[PDB]
A paper describes a structure:
We defined the atomic structures of all neck components, namely the head-to-tail, collar, and gateway factors, which connect the icosahedral head to the contractile tail. One unique penton of the [name] capsid is replaced by the dodecameric portal protein gp19, which is an attachment point for the ~1500 Å tail apparatus. However, unexpected for a Myoviridae, the [name] portal also contains a C-terminal α-helical barrel projecting into the head. Interestingly, the barrel is folded only in the pre-ejection conformation when DNA fills the capsid. [name] portal dodecamer is attached to twelve copies of the head-to-tail factor gp27, which closely resembles P22 gp437. The other two neck factors, gp28 and gp29, reduce the C12 symmetry found in the portal and head-to-tail to sixfold, which is maintained in most of the tail apparatus. Six collar proteins pack under the head-to-tail dodecamer with gp28 N-helix positioned orthogonal to two gp27 subunits, explaining the C12:C6 symmetry mismatch. The last neck factor, gp29, connects the neck to the sheath lattice.
Bacteriophage [name] infects Pseudomonas aeruginosa and is part of an experimental phage cocktail developed to eradicate P. aeruginosa infections in Galleria mellonella (wax moth) larvae and vertebrate models. [name] is a PB1-like Myoviridae of the Pbunavirus genus characterized by a ~66.2 kbp genome, significantly smaller than the classical enterobacteria phage T4 (~169 kbp). Here, we describe the structure of the whole [name] virion before and after DNA ejection at 3.1 Å and 4.5 Å resolution, respectively, determined using cryogenic electron microscopy (cryo-EM). We identify and build de novo structures for 19 unique [name] gene products, resolve the tail genome-ejection machine in both extended and contracted states, and decipher the complete architecture of the baseplate formed by 66 polypeptide chains.
Author numbering:
A (entry chain Z), B (entry chain c), C (entry chain G), D (entry chain H), E (entry chain I), F (entry chain W), ...: 1 to 155
H (entry chain g), I (entry chain h): 337 to 384
J (entry chain E), K (entry chain A): 2 to 124
Write the structure that this text describes.
Amino acid sequence: MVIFDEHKFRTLFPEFADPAAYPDVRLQMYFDIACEFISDRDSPYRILNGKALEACLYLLTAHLLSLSTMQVQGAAGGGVTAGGTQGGFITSATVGEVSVAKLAPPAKNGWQWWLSGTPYGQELWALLSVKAVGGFYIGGLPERRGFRKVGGTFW
Amino acid sequence: MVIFDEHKFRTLFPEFADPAAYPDVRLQMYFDIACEFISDRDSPYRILNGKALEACLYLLTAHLLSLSTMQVQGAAGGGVTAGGTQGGFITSATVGEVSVAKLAPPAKNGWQWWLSGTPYGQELWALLSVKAVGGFYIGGLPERRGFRKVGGTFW
Amino acid sequence: MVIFDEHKFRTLFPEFADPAAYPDVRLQMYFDIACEFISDRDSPYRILNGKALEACLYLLTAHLLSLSTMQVQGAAGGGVTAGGTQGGFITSATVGEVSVAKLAPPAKNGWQWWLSGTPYGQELWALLSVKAVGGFYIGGLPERRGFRKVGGTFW
Amino acid sequence: MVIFDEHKFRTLFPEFADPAAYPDVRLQMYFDIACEFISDRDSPYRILNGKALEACLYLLTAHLLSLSTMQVQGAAGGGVTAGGTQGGFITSATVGEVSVAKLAPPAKNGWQWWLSGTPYGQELWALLSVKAVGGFYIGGLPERRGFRKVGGTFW
Amino acid sequence: MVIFDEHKFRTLFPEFADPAAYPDVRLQMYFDIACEFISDRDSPYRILNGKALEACLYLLTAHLLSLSTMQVQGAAGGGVTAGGTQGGFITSATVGEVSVAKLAPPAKNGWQWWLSGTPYGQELWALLSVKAVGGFYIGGLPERRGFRKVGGTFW
Amino acid sequence: MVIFDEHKFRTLFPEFADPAAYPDVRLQMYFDIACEFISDRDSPYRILNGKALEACLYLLTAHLLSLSTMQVQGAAGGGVTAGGTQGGFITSATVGEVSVAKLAPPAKNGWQWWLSGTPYGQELWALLSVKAVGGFYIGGLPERRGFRKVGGTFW
Amino acid sequence: MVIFDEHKFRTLFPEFADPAAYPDVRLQMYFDIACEFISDRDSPYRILNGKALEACLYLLTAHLLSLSTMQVQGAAGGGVTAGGTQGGFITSATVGEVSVAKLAPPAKNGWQWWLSGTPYGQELWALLSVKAVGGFYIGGLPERRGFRKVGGTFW
Amino acid sequence: HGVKVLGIDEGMEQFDTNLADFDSIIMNQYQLVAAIAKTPATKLLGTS
Amino acid sequence: HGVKVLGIDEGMEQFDTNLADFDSIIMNQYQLVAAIAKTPATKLLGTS
Amino acid sequence: IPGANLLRMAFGVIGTQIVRYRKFEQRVKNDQAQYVSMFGEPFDLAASVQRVRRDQYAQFNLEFQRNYVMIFANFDMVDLDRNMAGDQFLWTGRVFQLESQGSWFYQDGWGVCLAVDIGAAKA
Amino acid sequence: IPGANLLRMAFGVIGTQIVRYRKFEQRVKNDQAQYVSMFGEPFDLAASVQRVRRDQYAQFNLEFQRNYVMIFANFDMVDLDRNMAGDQFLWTGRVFQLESQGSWFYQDGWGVCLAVDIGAAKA
């Protein structure tokens, strides 16, 4: 478990600087929820270590907070919408005589598609993609140490 | 069985905070319905354990509650529609001079397609996808502990 | 045979609260019809056991009731439509200057396509999809109990 | 043969309750036509038996009656159209400023395509699809009862 | 040879009730033509036997009658059209601000495509499709009767 | 860790020259965030070394700063947007009587798709692609030094 | 290391003749950056050497200069745009009643897609494509010198 | 007799190597060594 | 008895080489060498 | 098909609003040769309310903006004949002027914003 | 769907501007039978501003080009009734004449350029 710092979180994301609209209890609760999507245990032998793990946890917390605060007060009727607001990437938009079309991200399952909803989720996905290079070797024993090779060595 | 905490549930979702519109008996009934979709037995040897199971159950309850809301006051005329309101992800919409198009999630069966109708369902699907990585090995005996390997070890 | 309870059914689906428009005899008849699509026999060894079975039965009964009540009073002429009202999933719609386009469900046969008609059918399909994971092994005998393995065991 | 209950038939579908518009002889004739599409012989060893088979026959009768209505009074000018009214699932429709698009059912031959014309046909197709799971094995003898297996058993 | 009954034919299809526009001689001639597309002889060993044979013959006769009678009075000039009126399934239609789009039937040869022209042809196609399940085994002899199996039996 | 020079950073990008709008502490924070994505250890045996590594780090810092600006004051109303501004390559755009369409970059995962949001990200991706040509061979021993070849040489 | 000559650069690209808007310090800095995308080391054995290398470096420097100078003065507000101006090839355009559509270049990675942004990049890509014909043979020894062929020769 | 459960998008692949050819080259080199020493290989290696 | 874990976009491939033909070449060369020197191969190489 | 209504299935997707609807029965005088209307039993109806969005004008140094609304409903609504039309209120009283495809399956509407509603739970 | 605010999510892509908006409260007289209005507490609002692009006319030697602006905002704003109008200024005071789909989720605006703003940080 990693101790959540409200001051650092507010410094990193100035859009959450308002203490009245964003109480500390909500941030702590969302951090507690987010520590289940990603393990909060830290060891030096992991892939996401220390500050990287902290950054991922903070980004996930911000993503959850934004998605949650979307519903409560947006529809001009206090979220009177029957089914709430559905998230997701917006490929195209149009307002009067202004039109924008964007590039669809390469989502292939629920995790990435959900992460693509908000910029914090996109940044988290990018960081995970960078850190995901390579692979694991789990089972095996050093069998080659028993045979002499090249220059009379066993390494 | 897992005890359902109504106070903490309303704490999690402020949009359901009204006890007049959402009686506690209705919430208990929906939790009892949702405990059949996902087994609520908790053991340390399950992949879903700890407060993650509570989060999943609460998200499923919220999804069912939102779908229920969509019917009787979603039409708001006592559900006078012949077939009732239908659920599902809305890929495109247009209201007057504003139009937006979103990205279709990768649904492959009834479970994921039904989940993708509301934000709580999407979050539950994402959490399940995160926790679903890996696999199981069911039948097997340690046959490799009978032979001497490498450095005279049996492990 | 499972005893149908009108009071619990009306509690579960408030849109069927009106006793004048929905007599008890009609509900009982539709439950009797629904007990042939899904077997009403119950045993602890079945995949669908416990009150999940009656949940599916109630959902199927509600689906049948909605589809049936569609025809009688739809076209403002007492269902004077020559061929009735055909069911199905509505992919897109438009009323004046409002348009909605939704995601088509993954239907492969008549059963799923029919179930996609109404929200109760969609819920039933989702529950069946969740409970359909795994498989059956029917024939076979424990042949492995006759040989000694690993630590001098026969299990 | 199976006895056709006119009273119960009218009870099932209230839209046919008018005896003046739908004489009993017409219903009996359509039942006699429908008993050739589906064999009405009842045995405990069939997949379709009992009230399920009775409901199948009644649904087929209702489908035939509705299709007959489309021609007799769908045009209502005495069927003055040169080609006659044609049946089938309506994929899309538009009346004035309202347009609706539906999902195409998976029809693979004449039987399912013809069934999908009316809601009763869709219901019959769905019930047949539910009951159709499984398979048959006709030619065969208990060959495995002549050898001793596992625990000295022949079963 | 099945004897054509004019009274039963007029009872089955009320749209042909008028004797002035539909003389008996024309109906008999069209039945005599239709008894060549489908063999009019009956045996108990045939797949199509009993009332199904006469139902198929009546449907084919009605189809031919409709196709023929469309030609002579369509264009309000006694069929003055140079090439006549062509048949076929109407996928889409539009009259003013009323539009309908239908589902194309799965026609693969001339027979089915021609049958899809009129509702009687569609019903005939459906009946043939239902009765067409299975196959024939024509050549072969009971070889297995000469060997002893299982419990000293030769069956 | 490589020392981050704010003076030369502002020299490189004149659009960030204003110290009041972009305090040095914010730049140091974003550099500390960026050094987690790319390892800042410098050795002569890496693919990225010399001023290439610091150029990559500065470009990543500029990308993060530009996205931060887009979030904080892209809306400029305190980020009162429901989910915040989303990033990505803009395939097409239209403002009044002028429309422009561009070529979609070949993105294959979250890293490249996220990078393509801003010109600095595109430049960083291009430099990484240039430097990425070739490959590695890791586990190996000079087994070819023990034999005599061609001109009595062992090399 | 190739010494950058501002006089030759300004002679080659007259659009950068203005010394006030393009100080020599910026040109030298961009040359120092560009000497890292392409190695500035020169040897007679290299595929690109001498004047070809000089032209490649100059083209890359011009490309970088154009991309950089796009941002600072684009939107008539000193690049007040939150995310800057993105680059890329423009496959279509429209201004009033003038429209042009061009051919998309065959870009397959980040390097080529970035190079296609500006004409200098396109020329650099073309030159590299011409000079990229053929391949390298890196390992091997002259084994054929030890055998006699044709006219008693060892060549 | 053990079953591994995997996801739908999962995949597993196996590789094998063939080692039949080593005997011929080993015996050829040993025969050459015996030839250099000017002694029959039966004496050096115990067998032909 | 070990497992390697790779990404969905990653791949692995192997190659071999068949060495079942050098024997005839070597032995033919040695037979020719024996033929040149006017000496039976059973003495120069020690084995036919 | 101009048979089964399309508005009914349309309301199963888009979502609607709720209005109170009252019909016109008969009319009398008030010893000034001025008609006063009578309405009975205002029931509850589900309908879709749309946008037409007025601009204003001038008679002479007065403004007099006309408030307008478009409504879609599956009901037989009459706007004018030798009798009088019906009323509604989303938040204030309203009256319409049009017809639509009532005798088949559904209609369409209009509305001009009358002043206010009485109150006491929006009578 | 006429539920969740579409302009809310659309503003997350295109990008908007910032204006200062003040609402009307009540008005009094100035012993000339001329109404003088008063507003209250101007605040910051996020909106998208468009063009309709004026062309001028003449009365006699007087050109009188009238300046217009189109604004999209998620605010339930009123242009005219038996009360006054609202005000805004991107750089100079403006007043609008229209309505839009306010009671669901968003509206649309207008604007005529009044003369100037006061100054002193653009009051």
